[PDB]
Amino acid sequence: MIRVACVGITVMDRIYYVEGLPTESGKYVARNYTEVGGGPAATAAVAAARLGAQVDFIGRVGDDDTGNSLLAELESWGVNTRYTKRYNQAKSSQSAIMVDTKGERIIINYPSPDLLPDAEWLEEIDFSQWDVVLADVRWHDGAKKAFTLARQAGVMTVLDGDITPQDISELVALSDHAAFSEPGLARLTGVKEMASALKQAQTLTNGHVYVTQGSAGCDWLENGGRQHQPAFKVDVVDTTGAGDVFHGALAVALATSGDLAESVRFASGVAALKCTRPGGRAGIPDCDQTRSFLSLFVLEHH
Amino acid sequence: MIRVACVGITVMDRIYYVEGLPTESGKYVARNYTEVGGGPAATAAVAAARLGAQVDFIGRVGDDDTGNSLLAELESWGVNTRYTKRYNQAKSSQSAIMVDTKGERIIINYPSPDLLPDAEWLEEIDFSQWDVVLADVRWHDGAKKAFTLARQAGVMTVLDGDITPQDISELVALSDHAAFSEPGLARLTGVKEMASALKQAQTLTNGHVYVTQGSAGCDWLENGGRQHQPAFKVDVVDTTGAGDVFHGALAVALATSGDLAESVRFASGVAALKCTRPGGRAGIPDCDQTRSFLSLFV
Numbered sequence: 238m239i240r241v242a243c244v245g246i247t248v249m250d251r252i253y254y255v256e257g258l259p260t261e262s263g264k265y266v267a268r269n270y271t272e273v274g275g276g277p278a279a280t281a282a283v284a285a286a287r288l289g290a291q292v293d294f295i296g297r298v299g300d301d302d303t304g305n306s307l308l309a310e311l312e313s314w315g316v317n318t319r320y321t322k323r324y325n326q327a328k329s330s331q332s333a334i335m336v337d338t339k340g341e342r343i344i345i346n347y348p349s350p351d352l353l354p355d356a357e358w359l360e361e362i363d364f365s366q367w368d369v370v371l372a373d374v375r376w377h378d379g380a381k382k383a384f385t386l387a388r389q390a391g392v393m394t395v396l397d398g399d400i401t402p403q404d405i406s407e408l409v410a411l412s413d414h415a416a417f418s419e420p421g422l423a424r425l426t427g428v429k430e431m432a433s434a435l436k437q438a439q440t441l442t443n444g445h446v447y448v449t450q451g452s453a454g455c456d457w458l459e460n461g462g463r464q465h466q467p468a469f470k471v472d473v474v475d476t477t478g479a480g481d482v483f484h485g486a487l488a489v490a491l492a493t494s495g496d497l498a499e500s501v502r503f504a505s506g507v508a509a510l511k512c513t514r515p516g517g518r519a520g521i522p523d524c525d526q527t528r529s530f531l532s533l534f535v536l537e538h539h
Numbered sequence: 540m541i542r543v544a545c546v547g548i549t550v551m552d553r554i555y556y557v558e559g560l561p562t563e564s565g566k567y568v569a570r571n572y573t574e575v576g577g578g579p580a581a582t583a584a585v586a587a588a589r590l591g592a593q594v595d596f597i598g599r600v601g602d603d604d605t606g607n608s609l610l611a612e613l614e615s616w617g618v619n620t621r622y623t624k625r626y627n628q629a630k631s632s633q634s635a636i637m638v639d640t641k642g643e644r645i646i647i648n649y650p651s652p653d654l655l656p657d658a659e660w661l662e663e664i665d666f667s668q669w670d671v672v673l674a675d676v677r678w679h680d681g682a683k684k685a686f687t688l689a690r691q692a693g694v695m696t697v698l699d700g701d702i703t704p705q706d707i708s709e710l711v712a713l714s715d716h717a718a719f720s721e722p723g724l725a726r727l728t729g730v731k732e733m734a735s736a737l738k739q740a741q742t743l744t745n746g747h748v749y750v751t752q753g754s755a756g757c758d759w760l761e762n763g764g765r766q767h768q769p770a771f772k773v774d775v776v777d778t779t780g781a782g783d784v785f786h787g788a789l790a791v792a793l794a795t796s797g798d799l800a801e802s803v804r805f806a807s808g809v810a811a812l813k814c815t816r817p818g819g820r821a822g823i824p825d826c827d828q829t830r831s832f833l834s835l836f837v
């Protein structure tokens with residue numbers, strides 16, 4: 238089967254369901270609240286595990302109750318946490334998330350400063366044991382080190398190019414597949430027009446560049462041409478982690494088939510189904526539920 | 540010795556310090572984070588205790604870590620929690636708060652569905668043991684019952700009239716002093732213009748009506764005539780709980796002096812100093828620090 242490493246952040250999601258996204262200063266009341274594990278690499282690992290892969294998550298937690306809950310949750314999804322570092326006297330990372338009734342979200346992330354950025358401890362891990370290494374940009378040194386070791390071992394690298402304060406140029410160069418979010422690509426290039434931004438991103442790597450655009454689907458460059466995969470329409474409750482699940486599914490599909498069109502289509506299906514349930518994980522389908530959704534899509538109007 | 544009861548909510552504040560208030564969907568990074576006790580009545584109790592009063596906090600928590608932390612923190616501030624109800628197998632309330640570099644804040648409160656509104660147990664408490672009862676509007680049945688019992692014992696009632704979903708008319712009627720937030724007054728009256736809203740609020744009560752307006756200060760009515768107290772300019776880090784601290788200070792000052800202008804001025808000073816430090820509580824001054832701060836104005 239497919240052996241996956243996911244390198245990046247694991248954070249506790251504190252999700253507030255509101256009438257509307259709070260645009261202005263004031264007091265608001267949440268209609269509902271859920272506390273669930275998140276973080277791009279960690280949710281991507283859960284997607285890979287749901288889809289049949291043998292999955293390692295490699296990141297950093299504190300020794301607070303949050304840390305032990307984050308890792309226990311990943312283990313219950315079939316994600317192995319043996320390579321995750323526990324810092325002592327450390328808070329784990331967490332986010333406040335506001336989701337409106339259309340499933341659009343504001344995420345405020347607080348990276349715990351007790352989790353050191355040092356990635357040298359990754360050098361003790363044998364990266365040659367995996368078919369694919371996924372990394373998020375939210376642990377910059379972990380992504381740089383993991384992709385360097387993965388390229389040296391001849392293992393495919395897949396980047397979750399989300400928005401982040403630092404420049405991710407050097408992570409993109411180490412990426413076989415650099416799958417940006419719309420905001421991620423805009424921050425990296427400083428260009429708001431997606432088509433021109435994607436051509437600029439392509440100059441940063443010999444790998445493939447993609448950009449996800451929520452319900453507008455996914456664009457990528459292949460044979461010097463602009464490719465496209467529409468989103469699948471579903472009853473959306475929560476788009477939180479759509480990107481994370483898309484990246485997990487894309488890494489599994491790319492490692493399985495090598496086929497960009499079929500892999501992006503597969504990942505779009507998995508991400509669409511995730512959007513139908515609250516949080517990053519409850520809606521994640523297995524391989525069989527995904528193939529039913531994708532193969533019966535053409536037998537009905539949707 | 541001022542004896543104060545504060546009736547209302549205690550919630551855990553999860554405060555995110557951001558570059559700017561999110562004006563649209565997306566991913567943002569907080570530069571800093573602090574987790575601190577809050578809730579209007581609970582922070583008002585802390586202000587009262589810092590200002591020398593003997594303070595009871597009367598609210599509801601669960602038996603989760605959050606609940607036990609909220610009460611332990613109040614005890615560490617010198618607030619007595621003996622009358623607070625601890626519900627079995629129940630989660631406590633909490634808020635996510637975003638504070639920008641100017642100290643402006645968005646608060647998202649999640650009221651625990653495990654905390655019963657039932658206020659009948661307040662009947663087992665002798666309300667005559669306090670000089671003043673403060674209540675917030677986020678525990679409506681507790682405020683109604685506590686104000687009813689306080690009025691029956693002849694004890695002064697002070698309302699924190701913040702924004703909340705339910706109509707607070709009946710709480711305002713039971714209020715000797717109804718001190719609204721700008722949003723709270725607008726929600727109650729459905730009038731955006733502060734001057735005509737305050738006159739409309741005055742028709743609901745034989746008490747005094749006030750409205751706080753952040754750095755624009757505080758307005759109130761004395762015999763139909765609008766009084767004003769400007770805010771005191773400070774280096775603002777965080778306006779979270781300014782209202783809460785203002786109400787705690789106002790209740791102590793009213794119970795002490797009964798001069799409205801001097802009480803509002805005092806409470807404005809206490810609230811201004813709170814704004815200089817993160818969260819609802821770290822910046823709360825004692826009586827001596829407040830008098831020093833006020834002496835440098837006219």
Ligand SMILES: Nc1ncnc2c1ncn2[C@@H]1O[C@H](COP(=O)(O)OP(=O)(O)O)[C@@H](O)[C@H]1O
Nearest residue numbers: 418449450451452454468479480483505508509
């Ligand atoms: N509203 C939606 N409806 C259906 N599919 C969606 C929706 N939002 C996202 N997806 C799927 O998930 C992918 C990634 O979502 P996107 O919002 O671009 O990522 P991120 O959450 O990282 O910003 C999309 O390209 C699409 O395949």
Ligand SMILES: Nc1ncnc2c1ncn2[C@@H]1O[C@H](COP(=O)(O)OP(=O)(O)O)[C@@H](O)[C@H]1O
Nearest residue numbers: 720751752753754756770781782785807810811
């Ligand atoms: N930026 C500020 N500078 C000085 N004083 C302030 C500031 N914000 C609030 N205060 C003081 O605290 C009082 C209550 O603050 P306000 O924002 O009106 O309450 P709330 O937090 O309930 O909205 C104000 O009337 C004022 O005296």
Ligand SMILES: O=S(=O)(O)C[C@H]1O[C@](O)(CO)[C@@H](O)[C@@H]1O
Nearest residue numbers: 275276277332344346375478566
């Ligand atoms: O990427 S961050 O904002 O640092 C963390 C959040 O990202 C998600 O994984 C969604 O893509 C959430 O589950 C995290 O809170």
Ligand SMILES: O=S(=O)(O)C[C@H]1O[C@](O)(CO)[C@@H](O)[C@@H]1O
Nearest residue numbers: 264552577578579634648677780
């Ligand atoms: O009033 S609520 O929004 O429910 C609770 C918040 O109010 C404050 O006390 C400030 O007024 C915060 O500390 C609470 O989170």
Ligand SMILES: [Mg+2]
Nearest residue numbers: 451476479480
């Ligand atoms: Mg999205």
Ligand SMILES: [Mg+2]
Nearest residue numbers: 752753778781
């Ligand atoms: Mg204010």
